[PDB]
Amino acid sequence: MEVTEEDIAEIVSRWTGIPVSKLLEKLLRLEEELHKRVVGQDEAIRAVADAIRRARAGLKDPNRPIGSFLFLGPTGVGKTELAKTLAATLFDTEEAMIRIDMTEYMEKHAVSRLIGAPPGGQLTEAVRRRPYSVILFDEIEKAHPDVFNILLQILDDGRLTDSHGRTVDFRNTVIILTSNLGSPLILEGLQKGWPYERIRDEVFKVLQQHFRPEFLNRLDEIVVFRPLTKEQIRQIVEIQLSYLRARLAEKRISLELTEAAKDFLAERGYDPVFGARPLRRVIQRELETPLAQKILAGEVKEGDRVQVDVGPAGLVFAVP
Numbered sequence: 001m002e003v004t005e006e007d008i009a010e011i012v013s014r015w016t017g018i019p020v021s022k023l024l025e026k027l028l029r030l031e032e033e034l035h036k037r038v039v040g041q042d043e044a045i046r047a048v049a050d051a052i053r054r055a056r057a058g059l060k061d062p063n064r065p066i067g068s069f070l071f072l073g074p075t076g077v078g079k080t081e082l083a084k085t086l087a088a089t090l091f092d093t094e095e096a097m098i099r100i101d102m103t104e105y106m107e108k109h110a111v112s113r114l115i116g117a118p119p120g121g122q123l124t125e126a127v128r129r130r131p132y133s134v135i136l137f138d139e140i141e142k143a144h145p146d147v148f149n150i151l152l153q154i155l156d157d158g159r160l161t162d163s164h165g166r167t168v169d170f171r172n173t174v175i176i177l178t179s180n181l182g183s184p185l186i187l188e189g190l191q192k193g194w195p196y197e198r199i200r201d202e203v204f205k206v207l208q209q210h211f212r213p214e215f216l217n218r219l220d221e222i223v224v225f226r227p228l229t230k231e232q233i234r235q236i237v238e239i240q241l242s243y244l245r246a247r248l249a250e251k252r253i254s255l256e257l258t259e260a261a262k263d264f265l266a267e268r269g270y271d272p273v274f275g276a277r278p279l280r281r282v283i284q285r286e287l288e289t290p291l292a293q294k295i296l297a298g299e300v301k302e303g304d305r306v307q308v309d310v311g312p313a314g315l316v317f318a319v320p
């Protein structure tokens, strides 16, 4: 009890470079740990956990990354949240997530930005100093063909060569590729009033053009994220209020939102175009702004429990 297991692990982790979570059973309950931050998207969470279990059981090729995934579906429904959460659970921190925006690698000479200029990179140096990391490639269809070839090398041998010719090890990484292809086209067809078979057939040809079977066969799983239900959005709202409540808890102030108040923020904080991205500024504008005035005015004080309900002209604040 005096010297804990984390005490020993942190010594070993410092000398070896292996993260504490890897050194320290918990893979059996990996899905419930990811669900603490990621609401819904059960299929994506199952797929990720299953792949990680195959790797650790010694069932997969050792000369490859831990796992590789393609995440399809719309914007703002949990793709990045899962990647960040995966990094925190597996590698102890969100700093262990490396993000590559492929919109910045569309113009031919972008390969030198990835692996470094010729004798005359961002990804290579990043992974060199963090072997244990989650790498997120966003908007993968935007990538230049030559840039796309470098990604296939990582999938094929779990390593990568840079400018000098020296290798960078990718065997301890998790690769997540994300794309939005098809989702805007569906919204276009629904607004234009196309029948279903029109929308369905047009999505498959667009996916066919960009994602060929030679590429997809290298991946562990292809997962399509779905839009969030009204129930699930209410859970996001409750998660997003966490930091505010912790700030208010220092002055012993409670925020009891009524059921209609959560629906108010949920209706404005979510839409099919941007997903739940607008929610942060909706909370800031509709809740945090008028609450700040109440506190500054002297209506809300130390120890007061506040009821948040909805009338016309936005949210109303009441005290017992």
Ligand SMILES: Nc1ncnc2c1ncn2[C@@H]1O[C@H](COP(=O)(O)OP(=O)(O)O)[C@@H](O)[C@H]1O
Pocket (backbone or CB within 6 Å): 037, 038, 039, 040, 041, 074, 075, 076, 077, 078, 079, 080, 081, 236, 239, 240, 275, 276, 277, 279
């Ligand atoms: N499944 C989810 N679980 C928890 N929060 C979510 C979920 N989906 C969306 N959000 C919230 O909405 C925001 C959407 O951003 P993000 O997930 O980064 O979008 P994308 O996945 O398109 O990159 C997040 O910051 C998060 O707070």
